[PDB]
């Protein structure tokens, strides 16, 4: 087979681990405070902790940017260098950044085949199929037969981002979108959707669960990544408690970075959940 490269952006939260095992690597999209200070959105975990402590404690909430149309030519023309034959480029929903269309425009200027996907998610949900797209490409499957099998899995729903948030008042101010109310949305169609508040995380964990049940039998299958956005008890809580109605063959637990935090607000915790 052909050496194809996979490419997701940092709004993936992609685990850390991942980047070698199923070789993804991830492009940074951009913080920019009020101040003017922009800073890159690196899967760093060091990084990512020290940012956490920097939107809690400050002044305002930051805006955040796609990469620009010379950030992917640069990561293109660099996997060329590396002696890949093409790059398969996941981003998150087109409708809730320019990341795609701008991931679409640098690949037309390029040598290298580019081919990118609007996975129509964002965060732990996105490294989903980019791992299963890594497994096919392992076991022989061409690129066409990659994008038509995703294409599948997307139809059937197959690749969930559901989760709650803290303080509501981060997506308000972020545009896509009481004491311990906590507020819970999931991605439909590419767009975030709030479908329910109640009060405390326990109550959250089950709601984030019973939505999953609505078209996932208990006992089906999963495979999952726990997101979190400096609340790592909270996310374990959550993958506990959904062990318990279904079959986890596999499970990990990633922090959400700069940019999906900056949206999200700390204390935020979900689950990216692939229906094998
Ligand atoms: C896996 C479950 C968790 C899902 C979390 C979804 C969070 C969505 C928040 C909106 C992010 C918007 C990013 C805009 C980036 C840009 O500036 O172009």
Redesign the pocket.
């Known amino acids: 087979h052909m050496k194809v490269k996979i490419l997701v952006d940092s709004?993936a939260?992609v685990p850390f681990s991942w980047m070698e095992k199923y070789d993804i690597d991830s492009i940074p999209?951009?913080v920019v405070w009020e101040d003017g200070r922009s800073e890159p959105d690196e899967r760093e975990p060091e990084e990512i902790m020290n940012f956490y402590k920097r939107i809690r404690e400050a002044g305002s909430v930051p805006?955040?940017?796609?990469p620009s149309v010379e950030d992917f030519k640069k990561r293109y023309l660099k996997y060329k260098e590396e002696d890949y034959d093409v790059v398969l480029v996941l981003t998150?929903?087109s409708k809730?950044?320019?990341?795609y269309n701008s991931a679409v425009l640098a690949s037309k200027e390029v040598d290298i085949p580019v081919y990118v996907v609007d996975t129509l998610?964002?965060?732990?949900?996105?490294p989903l199929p980019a791992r299963v797209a890594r497994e096919m490409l392992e076991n022989g499957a061409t690129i066409e037969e990659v994008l038509k099998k995703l294409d599948e899995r997307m139809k059937n729903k197959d690749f969930?981002?559901?989760?709650y948030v803290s303080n509501f008042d981060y997506?308000v101010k972020?545009?896509?979108?009481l004491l311990k109310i906590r507020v819970c949305?999931?991605?439909e169609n590419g767009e975030?959707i709030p479908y329910r508040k109640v009060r405390g995380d326990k109550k959250a964990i089950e709601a984030l669960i019973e939505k999953l049940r609505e078209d996932t039998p208990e006992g089906s299958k999963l495979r999952v990544?726990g997101?979190h956005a400096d609340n790592e008890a909270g996310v374990v809580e959550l993958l506990n408690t959904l062990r318990k109605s279904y079959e986890v063959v596999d499970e990990i637990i990633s922090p959400?970075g700069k940019?999906?935090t900056?949206?999200?607000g700390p204390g935020?915790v979900?689950?990216?959940?692939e229906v094998l």
């Open positions: 709004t939260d999209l951009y805006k955040t940017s796609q998150l929903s809730l950044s320019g990341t998610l964002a965060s732990g949900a996105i969930k981002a559901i989760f997506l972020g545009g896509r979108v949305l999931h991605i975030l990544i997101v959400m940019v999906i900056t949206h999200v935020t979900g689950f990216g959940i």
